[PDB]
Amino acid sequence: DRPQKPFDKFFIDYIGPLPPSQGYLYVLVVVDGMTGFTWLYPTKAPSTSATVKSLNVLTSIAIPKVIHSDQGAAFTSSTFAEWAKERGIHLEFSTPYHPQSSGKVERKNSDIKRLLTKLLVGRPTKWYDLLPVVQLALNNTYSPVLKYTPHQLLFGIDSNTPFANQDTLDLTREEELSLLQEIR
Amino acid sequence: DRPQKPFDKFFIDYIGPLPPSQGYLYVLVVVDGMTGFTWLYPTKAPSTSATVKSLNVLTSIAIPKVIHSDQGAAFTSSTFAEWAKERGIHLEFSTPYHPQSSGKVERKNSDIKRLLTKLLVGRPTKWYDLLPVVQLALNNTYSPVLKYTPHQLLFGIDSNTPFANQDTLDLTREEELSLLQEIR
Amino acid sequence: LDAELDQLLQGHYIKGYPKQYTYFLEDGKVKVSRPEGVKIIPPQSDRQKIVLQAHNLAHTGREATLLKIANLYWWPNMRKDVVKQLGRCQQCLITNASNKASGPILRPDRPQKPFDKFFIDYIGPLPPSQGYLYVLVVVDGMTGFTWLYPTKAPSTSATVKSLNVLTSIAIPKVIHSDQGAAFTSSTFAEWAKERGIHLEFSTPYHPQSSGKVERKNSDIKRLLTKLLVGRPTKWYDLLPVVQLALNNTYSPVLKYTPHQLLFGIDSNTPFANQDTLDLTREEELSLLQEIRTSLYHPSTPPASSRSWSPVVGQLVQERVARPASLRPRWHKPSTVLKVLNPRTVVILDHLGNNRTVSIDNLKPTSHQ
Amino acid sequence: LDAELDQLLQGHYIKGYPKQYTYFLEDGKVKVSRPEGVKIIPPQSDRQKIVLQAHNLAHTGREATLLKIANLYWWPNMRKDVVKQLGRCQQCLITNASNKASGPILRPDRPQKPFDKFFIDYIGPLPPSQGYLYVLVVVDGMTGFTWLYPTKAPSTSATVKSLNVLTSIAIPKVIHSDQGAAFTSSTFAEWAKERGIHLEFSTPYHPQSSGKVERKNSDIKRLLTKLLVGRPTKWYDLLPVVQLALNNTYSPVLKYTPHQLLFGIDSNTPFANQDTLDLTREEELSLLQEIRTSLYHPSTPPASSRSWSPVVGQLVQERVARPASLRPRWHKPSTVLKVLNPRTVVILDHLGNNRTVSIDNLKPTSHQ
DNA sequence: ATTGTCATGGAATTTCGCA
DNA sequence: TGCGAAATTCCATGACA
DNA sequence: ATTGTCATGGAATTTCGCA
DNA sequence: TGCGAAATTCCATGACA
Ligand SMILES: CCN1C[C@H](C)n2c(c(O)c3c(=O)n(Cc4ccc(F)c(Cl)c4)nc(N4CCN(C)S4(=O)=O)c32)C1=O
Ligand SMILES: CCN1C[C@H](C)n2c(c(O)c3c(=O)n(Cc4ccc(F)c(Cl)c4)nc(N4CCN(C)S4(=O)=O)c32)C1=O
Ligand SMILES: [Mg+2]
Ligand SMILES: [Mg+2]
Ligand SMILES: [Mg+2]
Ligand SMILES: [Mg+2]
Ligand SMILES: [Mg+2]
Ligand SMILES: [Mg+2]
Ligand SMILES: [N+]
Ligand SMILES: [N+]
Ligand SMILES: [Zn+2]
Ligand SMILES: [Zn+2]
Fold it and tell me: Which residue range or ranges hold the Integrase catalytic domain (chains A, B)?
C-alpha cells in the first residue's frame, strides 16, 4: 500500500445556520486528509447548488481523488453525483448517524468550530470578512502528531505568516456570560 | 557673364477679365525665362492679394531670383514688394507703355493667349478645368529656336505626354462666326 | 490494436517495440517496464483519442503534449502521433504565432527618371487646422521630390482635385499606393485611365511596399513637430514651408537634395549650390543625367537564421488584418498559387479567391 | 572676427587656416580658393548665425546642415560649430529619435520560494461577459502558478476583494505590479501594510519589468481564443478552466508544470504524473526542494553593437508616455542621479523631481 | 525607490537499439 | 564501437495594450 | 496582379597638411 | 612616407497609424 498524499481525499461538511453576514449563513468546510489543510467557503444554504458553486472554485486549483462526507442532502443528491463523475472524483459517505474521518480531520474540524465560535461572539455578524484570517490561522497551526503545519506539508516551505502565538481557543468569563446573553 | 538658367527670371502677367469659371475671372501667367516653362493660376481678381496667394503656391516649389512684370497695380504695390523682399526676390519692371521680355517669352505669351481663345470658344465657362491640359500642351510644345521643349529643359528628360500633334492654334470658320455671335 | 498486442505478450517480436524490454499484462492492460518507470501501451485504435485528450487540456504544442502522455503511456514513435494531431487542430493553427521569420527584404531598383513612379499616401487624422484633417503626400520615386496637399478627408474626390493640380506640371507613368479606399475606388481608376497613368497597388496592410512615401511621412511629421513646439498645432499654413524645406534638404548618402535630382540646379533658396554656374544648361543637364544613374543603391540584407521562403503549393496562412478581441490572429490555411518574387505570393484562400499578399502577412502552416 | 581675417589677407599664418591656399578680398568679403571651388570665409562673429540659418531650414542634423553651409562658406572646423548648435536646439533634441540601443536585458533571479513574489496585472477591457470586462491575473514568481479573477473595472476595490480571496491560502512577501491606478492608490498601500506585504512597482510604462505576469497574459488570451473559436466570446465561465489548464501545463524548458513546482505532486487531473507514488510525502517534499533549486536560469544576452549604458551625471531624456499628435516624443533633458543597475536609473527632471525610470524609456542627449 | 518571459516547432545534437 | 533513426535539447521568433 | 526607406550621430576609415 | 587630427564615410537604430 502506497503512502498518503495531498489531494488523496478531501473531507467536506457544512456548518450552520449562522448569524447572517453579507447575506451568508453557512460555511462549507474542506479539509485535505493528508496535510490537514483547510479551505472555507461561505454559502447562503447547504444545497447541492451552493456546494457545486463553491467546489468549482476549489477544484479550479486542485482536484481530489476522493471526496468524503456524511449523508447530508447536498452531498447525496444525484446532481452532486453527476458533478463528481464529470470530474473523475469518487464520492465517499460515512454510514448514517456514524460520522468518521481520521484523528487529524476530527481534531481539525473541532478547532474550526471552536475557532469560529470564539470570533463570532462580540461580532456575530462580521464573520464573512474574517474567513481569510481564520484559514491562515488553521493552516499555520502546528500539528502535535507531525512536526509540521498544513502549509508546510502542502507547499514544502515555511509560511510568511507564522502563527507563533498558539491561542487559548477557550472562552473568557467575559465571552461566556455575553454569549449566554446573545441568544437570549 | 554666366549662362542663363532656370529660376533666373520669372515673367508674370495677368490675363482677363474672362467669362466666369467656378467663380474665377483671371489667369496669372508665369513663364520661366530660360526654359520657357509655364505655370498658370486662376484668380478672382488681378490684386496683390491674389498674386501673393498664387505665387506662394509656385514659390513653395521653386523660387526665382528675379520676377519681371509690367507696372500693373498688383505688381507695384508695396505689399507685393514686401513679399518679394521676404523671399530675397528682386523685382523688375518694364517702363510704362513699353513692355519687354525676350523673344522666347513674347512668343510663349502669344501662344498662351491664342491657345486660351481657341479653347474658350464653344465652352467659354469650362476653362478652369482645362488649365492643367493647357499647361501640359504649352510645356510639351517643341521650341523652333532650341531643339527642346520646356519640360525637357526643366527636367532633363522626355515627357510622358508628348504633344506630337502640333495644333493649328487658328480658328476654323465655325469658331470665327460663332465667336462673333458669342459676345453679341 | 489487440491483434498487435497479443503477439507481443507471448514474447514474439514486432517492429518498433524493442525486444530488450519485458511486456506484460496487469489490470487488463498491456504494460512495459521502461527506464522512466512502467507505462501502459494502449492499442493502436486508442492512440489518436489519447493524443487528442492530452492536447486539448490546454492546446499545447509538441513537447508539452508529449510530456502529458508520457506520464501514463508509451508506444513506438509517440511524437509522430502528437504532430499528426497538431497539424489537424484548426484552433491551434489559426491562433498560434509563427516562429519563422520572413526572408530578407527586396531593395527594388530606384525608378530611372523623375515622373516614372509616384508613391502616394495619406497622413491623418491630424488635429483640425483651418478645417483640414489629412495630408495627401505624393513622392516622386526617382528624386524623392515631394508634394503636400491638405484635405478634409482621405477621399478619392480630394485625391483627384490635388492630383489635377500636381499633374499640371507633368504626368507620371505609374502611381503606386496602398489599398486605401481613396485609391481603390473605380472613380480613381477612371481618372487614371483617362490620363494614361497605370495604378500599381501595394499588397494589403504592408506599408513597407509604399516605403518611399511612408518614410517621407516621418520627415514631414518630424519637421511639423519641431516647428509647432510651444505653439498650438496650426499646421495648415506650414505645409508649403515644410514641402519646400524637405525638397531642398540633402540626403547625406546621396549628397543631393531632391530638388537637385529633379532640376539639376538649385532655385533661389538659402545656401544655393553654385558649382554649375559656368556650365551651360545643356552641360548642366548632361552632368545631371550622369548623377542620376550613379546614385547609391542599397542591397538585400543577410537572411535571418530562421527565415522561410514560399514554395508553390505550400500551405500558408494570411494574417487577420484587424482581429477582434479574443479572436484568432490568422485565417484558415491556403495554397501558394504563384511565387511572384521571394517576398510576394498569390494565394488561393479556401473561398476560394486569388489574393496577392506580402510574405510578412504570412506564416507557413505548421506540421504540414 | 575682422582682426583674425586682416592678418590672413596680408599673407601671415593663423592656426587652423592652411598656409598653402591663397586667401583674397573680393566684393568686400574674404574668400579662399579650395579644391571644391571658391568659398567665403566669414568672420568668427558671423559663424554662429550662419550655422543656425543652415540648420533651421529643415532642422537637419550634422551632415545635412554642413552640406548646406559648405555650398557658400568655408572656415576651420565647421562641424564643431555645427555640432555646437545641434546640442542647443531644443526642438531637435526633444523631437529626433535615438539611434543608440539599450544595453542587454537583466534576467533577475527566480524567486527562491512560492509566495516570495507575486506579479499582478490587468487584462482588458475584454468584450462584456456576465457584465465583467477585466481579468486580474496574479502569478507566483517561483512557480508560475496563476490565479484569475474577473472584474468589472481595473480598480483597487476589485483588486482588494480578489486578493482577500487569494491570500486566504497564503500571504506573499512581495507583490510586484506596474503603476496602474488600481495598485498605486493609497487604499491599496494600506491594504498591503496591514498584511506585512511589501509593494514593489515596475518603472513606469515598461511592462517587461512585470514580464512574468505579462507573459502569462499571452497564454491566457491564447487559450481563451482557441476555446471560443466559432462561438460568442462568453469568457467569464471559462476563466476557471483556463486557470486549471495553464497551472497544469508543462514548460518544455523546465519539465514541470506550475502545479508541480507548487505542491510537488499532481492532483486528480488528466495524465497525472505517478513518479513519486512510492515516496512518503516527506521524501516527496525533499525531492521538490531539490527540483526548485536546480531549475534552468537564462543569462543576460550579448549587447548590440550600438548600445549605450547610463553613467552618473549624464544628460538623458525620458520618453513621453502618451504623446499627442504633432508633439515631441521626448521630454527635455535631465540628469542621471543614481545608476540602480545597468538597466535602471534615477533621474532629476528639470522640475525637478526624482524619477525611477527604465533605460528603455531613455535616450542619451545628443552632442553632449 | 529597481530588473523580461517563455510556448513554440524545425534543426542540431545526443542517445538508443542492435550488433 | 559504429550505424540509422528516434528522442531530446536548442533556440530564434514573437506577443504579453 | 508585385517588391522598404532613409535621417541620424557616434565610430571607423580615409584624407589632409606638413614635413 | 609617416604623423596627428580633421573630414568623410559607414551603418545600426528606429519610425513612417
Ligand atoms: C486602410 C489602408 N491602410 C492600411 C494600414 C492601415 N496602413 C495604411 C498606412 O498608410 C499605414 C501606415 O502608414 N502605417 C505606418 C507604418 C508602419 C510600419 C511600417 F513599416 C511603415 Cl513603412 C509604415 N501603418 C499602417 N498599418 C497599421 C498596422 N498595419 C495594419 S499596417 O497596414 O502595417 C498603415 C493604409 O492606408
Ligand atoms: C496604465 C499602466 N500601464 C502602462 C501601460 C499602458 N501598460 C500596462 C500594461 O499592463 C501593459 C501591457 O501589458 N503592455 C503589453 C506589453 C507590451 C510590450 C511588452 F514587452 C510587454 Cl511584456 C507587454 N503594454 C503596455 N504598454 C502599451 C505601450 N506602452 C505605453 S506600454 O507601457 O509598454 C502596458 C499598464 O497597466
Ligand atoms: Mg454534516
Ligand atoms: Mg499686364
Ligand atoms: Mg495609407
Ligand atoms: Mg502610411
Ligand atoms: Mg497593466
Ligand atoms: Mg500588461
Ligand atoms: N526592381
Ligand atoms: N536578481
Ligand atoms: Zn489545439
Ligand atoms: Zn533644430
Answer: 2-158
Q: Is A79 helix (H, G, I), strand (E, B) or coil?
A: helix
> Domains in chain A: how many in total?
1
Please name the amino acid found at residue A57.
V
Place of cell 506484460: C24
Q: Name the CATH topology of C98-105+304-365.
A: SH3 type barrels. (2.30.30)
Residue type, D295: L
Q: Given CA atoms D325, D330, D333, D334 in this order, what sign does their dihedral have? A: positive
Taking the C-alpha atoms of residue C340 and residue D59, their distance in angstroms, rounded to an integer, is 41
In CATH terms, D5-97 corresponds, of 3.30.420.10, 1.10.340.70, 3.40.30.10, 1.10.760.10, to: 1.10.340.70
SS (H, E, C) chain C: CHHHHHHHHCCCCCCCCCCCCCEEEECCEEEEEECCEEEECCCHHHHHHHHHHHHHCCCCCHHHHHHHHHHHECCCCHHHHHHHHHCCCHHHHHHCCCCCEECCCCCCCCCCCCCCEEEEEEECCCCCECCECEEEEEEECCCCCEEEEEECCCCHHHHHHHHHHHHCCCCCCEEEECCCHHHHCHHHHHHHHCCCCEEEECCCCCCCCCHHHHHHHHHHHHHHHHHHCCCCCCCHHHHHHHHHHHHCCCECCCCECHHHHHHCCCCCCCCCCCCCCCCCHHHHHHHHHHHHHCCCCCCCCCCCCCEECCCCCCEEEEECCCCCCCCCCECCCEEEEEEEECCEEEEECCCCCEEEEEHHHEEECCCC
Opening angle at CA C66, ends C62 and C67, nearest 5: 120
Nearest to A63 by CA among D248, D341, D157: D248
CA distance linking residue B134 with residue D18, whole number of Å: 57
Q: How was this structure determined?
A: X-ray
- Residues in CB range of C219: below 8 A, 6 or more apart: C246
Chain D residues with beta carbon closer than 8 angstroms to that of A159: 115, 170-171
Task: Output the nine-digit C-alpha cell for C45.
Answer: 485504435
Q: Is the CB of C121 under 6 A from ligand 1?
A: yes
Torsion of Cα atoms, D114 then D116 then D117 then D118, to 10°: 50
Tell me the chain C residues in contact with residue B2 when contact means C-beta distances shorter than 8 Å. 277-278
Pairing status of strand C174-177 against strand C117-123: parallel
Give the ligand with the smallest distance to the CA of B101. Answer: 4
A30 - beta bridge partners?
A: A12, A39
CATH class of C116-249: alpha beta
Q: Are the beta carbons of A61 and D269 separated by less than 8 Å?
A: no
Q: What distance in angstroms lies between residue C178's CA and the mean position of ligand 5's atoms?
A: 6
CA B16 to ligand 4 centroid distance, Å: 9
Q: Where are the domains of chain C?
A: 5-97, 98-105+304-365, 116-249, 250-295
CA dist., res. C139 & res. C243, Å (int): 11
- Nearest chain B alpha carbon to C284: B156
Q: What is the dihedral of CA D164, A40, A171, A169, to 10 degrees?
A: -90
D250-295 topology per CATH: Arc Repressor Mutant, subunit A (6.10.20)
Residues with CB under 5 A from ligand 5 (ion): C 121, 178, 180
Would you say the C-alpha torsion A76, A77, A83, A88 has a positive or negative sign?
Answer: positive
Please say whether the beta carbons of D172 and D148 come within 8 A. Answer: no
- Containing structural domain, residue B148: 1-184
| Least CB–CB distance from D278: residue in A2, A154, A157 | A2
Q: What is the CATH number of the domain that holds A172?
A: 3.30.420.10
Could you check whether the bond before residue B46 is cis, i.e. omega within 30 degrees of 0? no
